[PDB]
Amino acid sequence: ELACQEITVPLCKGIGYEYTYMPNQFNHDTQDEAGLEVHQFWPLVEIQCSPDLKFFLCSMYTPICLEDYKKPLPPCRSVCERAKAGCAPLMRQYGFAWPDRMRCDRLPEQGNPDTLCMDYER
Amino acid sequence: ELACQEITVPLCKGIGYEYTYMPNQFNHDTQDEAGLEVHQFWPLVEIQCSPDLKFFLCSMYTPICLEDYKKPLPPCRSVCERAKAGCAPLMRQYGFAWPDRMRCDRLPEQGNPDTLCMDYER
């Protein structure tokens, strides 16, 4: 189902977990393809409008792969809400809308035993 | 391995999940043994000093067991803090301290980078 592969995307190395799987939720078949899209957020990550932006992005583009849990473990909605609250305003100021694919309501909320997610808060 | 078994402990019905595993953290080998201890909290649950008490107690004595996730999923520290804040004072009124086994400091917090934990409240 989910074949784990060591993370190679530079922006996502050493983020807390070392393996990912493909294709991801965006149908990217390789890390290089995912990297071409997520690296566009490198500047915003460096600017630090949100401490959770890098983890949020990587949890979507290079999703965590666990040999024990053969199921996707997306970031919880709370992670996205924090990233959005911190960075969406600056983005809007320069003419960037919050990407539809990053809409937080698309993610599961924390606290549901039947639909687990990562709610890491940096 | 965590072999899931349907929860039979009367006090632990209506807590948001229906399966547990044994032995639990207290080395109880069966639900009847765990039930003998957790049922001592029956009066406090009925008095409703905390809406979180029942889930908290059960998440400790009849821990959550999932078919996909094969690892202990403890309640987050926040759950314990709310239950304690709501019921500890009452217990103290009669001369009893919050049980050491239910100490909140040893539980992981929401957003921690190591272990997933459960708290229905966000």
Curated annotation (Swiss-Prot), chains A, B:
Residues in FZ domain copies: 1-120
Superkingdom assignment: Eukaryota
Disulphide bridges: C4-C65, C12-C58, C49-C87, C76-C117, C80-C104
Residues annotated as glycosylated: E18, E121
Binding residue positions for hexadecanoate: Q40, F41, W42, P43, L44, V45, E46, I47
Subcellular location: Membrane; Golgi apparatus; Cell membrane
Tissue: Expressed in chondrocytes.
PTM info: Ubiquitinated by ZNRF3, leading to its degradation by the proteasome.
Region (Wnt-binding): 64-69, 116-121
Notes concerning its domains: Lys-Thr-X-X-X-Trp motif interacts with the PDZ domain of Dvl (Disheveled) family members and is involved in the activation of the Wnt/beta-catenin signaling pathway.
Function comment: Receptor for Wnt proteins. Component of the Wnt-Fzd-LRP5-LRP6 complex that triggers beta-catenin signaling through inducing aggregation of receptor-ligand complexes into ribosome-sized signalosomes. The beta-catenin canonical signaling pathway leads to the activation of disheveled proteins, inhibition of GSK-3 kinase, nuclear accumulation of beta-catenin and activation of Wnt target genes.
Family: Belongs to the G-protein coupled receptor Fz/Smo family.
Self-association state and partner proteins as the record states: Component of a Wnt-signaling complex that contains a WNT protein, a FZD protein and LRP5 or LRP6. Interacts directly with LRP5 or LRP6; the interaction is promoted by Wnt-binding and signaling and inhibited by DKK1. Interacts (via the PDZ-binding motif) with GPOC (via its PDZ domain). Interacts with RSPO1 and RSPO3. Interacts with glypican GPC3.
Protein name, entry field: Frizzled-8
Source organism of this protein record: Mus musculus (Mouse)
Gene expressing this chain: Fzd8
